[PDB]
Amino acid sequence: CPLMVKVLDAVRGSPAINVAVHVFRKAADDTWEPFASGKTSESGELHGLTTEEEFVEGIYKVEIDTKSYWKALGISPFHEHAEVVFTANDSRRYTIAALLSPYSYSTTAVVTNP
Amino acid sequence: CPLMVKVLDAVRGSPAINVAVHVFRKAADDTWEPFASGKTSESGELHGLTTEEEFVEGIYKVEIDTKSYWKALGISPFHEHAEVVFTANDSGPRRYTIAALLSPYSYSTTAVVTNP
Amino acid sequence: CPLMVKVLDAVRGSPAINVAVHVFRKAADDTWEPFASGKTSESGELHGLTTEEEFVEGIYKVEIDTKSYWKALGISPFHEHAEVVFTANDSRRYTIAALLSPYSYSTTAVVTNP
Amino acid sequence: CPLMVKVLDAVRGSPAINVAVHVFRKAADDTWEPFASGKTSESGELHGLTTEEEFVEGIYKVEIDTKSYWKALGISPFHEHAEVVFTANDSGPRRYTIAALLSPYSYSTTAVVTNP
Ligand SMILES: Cc1cc(OCC(=O)O)cc(C)c1Cc1ccc(O)c(Cc2ccccc2)c1
Numbered sequence: 001c002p003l004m005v006k007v008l009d010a011v012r013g014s015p016a017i018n019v020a021v022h023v024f025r026k027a028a029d030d031t032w033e034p035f036a037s038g039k040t041s042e043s044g045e046l047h048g049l050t051t052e053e054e055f056v057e058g059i060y061k062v063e064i065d066t067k068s069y070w071k072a073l074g075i076s077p078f079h080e081h082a083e084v085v086f087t088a089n090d091s092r093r094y095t096i097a098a099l100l101s102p103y104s105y106s107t108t109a110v111v112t113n114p
Numbered sequence: 115c116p117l118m119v120k121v122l123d124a125v126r127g128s129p130a131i132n133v134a135v136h137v138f139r140k141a142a143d144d145t146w147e148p149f150a151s152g153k154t155s156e157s158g159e160l161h162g163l164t165t166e167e168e169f170v171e172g173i174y175k176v177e178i179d180t181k182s183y184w185k186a187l188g189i190s191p192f193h194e195h196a197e198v199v200f201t202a203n204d205s206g207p208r209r210y211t212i213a214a215l216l217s218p219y220s221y222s223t224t225a226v227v228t229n230p
Numbered sequence: 231c232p233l234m235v236k237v238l239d240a241v242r243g244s245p246a247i248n249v250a251v252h253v254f255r256k257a258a259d260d261t262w263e264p265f266a267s268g269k270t271s272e273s274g275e276l277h278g279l280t281t282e283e284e285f286v287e288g289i290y291k292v293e294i295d296t297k298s299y300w301k302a303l304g305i306s307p308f309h310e311h312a313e314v315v316f317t318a319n320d321s322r323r324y325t326i327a328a329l330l331s332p333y334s335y336s337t338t339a340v341v342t343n344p
Numbered sequence: 345c346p347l348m349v350k351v352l353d354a355v356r357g358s359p360a361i362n363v364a365v366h367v368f369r370k371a372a373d374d375t376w377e378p379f380a381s382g383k384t385s386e387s388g389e390l391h392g393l394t395t396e397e398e399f400v401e402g403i404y405k406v407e408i409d410t411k412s413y414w415k416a417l418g419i420s421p422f423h424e425h426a427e428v429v430f431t432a433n434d435s436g437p438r439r440y441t442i443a444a445l446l447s448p449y450s451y452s453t454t455a456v457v458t459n460p
């Protein structure tokens with residue numbers, strides 16, 4: 001699929017499982033419209049968010065509900081969520097990886113050619 | 115000061131200089147209200163965004179304009195910005211440092227929260 | 231396999247391909263002895279480093295030749311290499327992930343139960 | 345001072361305090377010679393490790409004792425330490441800040457290199 005999300009937990013050294021993830025596309029009036037969502041699997045992965053036909057060029061936001069995830073582990077977190085905003089440009093499979101800690105997160109993009 | 119932002123460049127091993135930073139606060143009607151903004155200095159620091167009086171409890175969004183930064187350097191980066199969103203001062207006033215590390219296709223953000 | 235290495239490139243947004251990786255186990259006299267090595271694949275992965283029988287408890291070092299990798303891209307790097315040192319403890323597949331930038335690197339461990 | 349180390353804790357959103365740091369320099373015979381060592385302060389900073397005179401060209405290793413840090417907090421971390429290895433002063437004297445961010449199963453390290 002053209003867009004995949006992979007989330008890891010830096011405290012336990014494991015995939016971040018059952019993390020809610022919502023994806024939005026920016027519309028003509030500059031608001032975010034829901035596009036896709038899911039929960040990460042047992043391997044911290046979220047596949048089948050979209051298809052090639054639907055994933056057109058545009059500005060996308062991937063919002064990862066980190067706060068609910070830490071709350072379920074009984075750990076006080078800093079961030080309300082993690083939000084990754086990017087332009088999808090035709091020329092390409094996107095993997096958005098995120099590494100979570102209660103007071104920090106990192107995100108990287110892996111952009112590859114089939 | 116109660117809120118400070120520090121930005122580094124992981125390609126150039128230097129502070130990220132002249133990076134625009136915009137801070138918003140969630141209003142009663144659930145919309146983002148403009149709160150303060152500024153530019154990182156030669157040391158990659160942004161001080162003086164706010165005051166103890168003005169920086170009340172709330173949900174804040176710190177948006178770091180990573181894209182314009184990379185573009186001025188001739189790089190086409192992945193992200194539009196780096197965005198940090200947090201509830202501030204929920205148990206009384208704290209001092210927040212938002213530290214960000216930038217690469218063209220990655221960023222990290224961390225918070226240092228201390229009680230004066 | 232019990233030990234896997236995955237390396238990403240934060241400058242290009244891609245797997246880090248053809249990165250030399252050497253693994254060492256700490257011996258009784260506190261020196262590092264070569265244990266395994268390889269180069270990352272087209273997907274930035276290095277599999278088949280060791281087997282369950284051979285990967286006993288001990289202190290391991292994973293040395294990732296980041297400097298040669300940046301040099302091949304024509305980019306000046308800071309670090310001589312990236313070196314991840316850990317205790318492998320029985321109770322477990324280890325993924326060591328690393329995210330590379332010329333002046334920074336991060337590494338995380340994903341430790342999972344088959 | 346020419347070499348400074350700054351350490352943060354990503355679990356506690358605070359400086360990493362009382363972290364041991366050992367610095368070595370590669371000798372002529374290719375072995376690591378002890379160069380300087382110290383403990384991070386209440387701000388997670390380690391200053392005064394060396395001087396401009398003493399900090400000559402060479403390959404240096406900065407070893408941050410992350411394991412003892414986590415253990416004193418009751419965590420069993422993954423890594424034995426965080427180790428940064430770099431050629432220093434190859435085009436003349438520079439000032440180096442080694443910044444590290446710590447989680448039990450992860451760490452990041454970055455370098456800020458400036459020309460006084
Ligand atoms: C907050 C701060 C105080 C500080 O005081 C030292 C000084 O400059 O005198 C120095 C620095 C480089 C910093 C910023 C800083 C420290 C560690 C660090 O890892 C980072 C960048 C970072 C940001 C997110 C994830 C990993 C790294 C910045």
Ligand SMILES: Cc1cc(OCC(=O)O)cc(C)c1Cc1ccc(O)c(Cc2ccccc2)c1
Binds near residue numbers: 095106110325327337
């Ligand atoms: C481990 C892995 C598995 C994976 O699925 C395939 C597999 O499990 O073999 C896909 C990816 C991109 C990865 C690597 C990865 C996942 C999350 C993540 O945040 C990072 C980057 C990172 C690495 C170290 C420190 C901070 C951030 C890499």
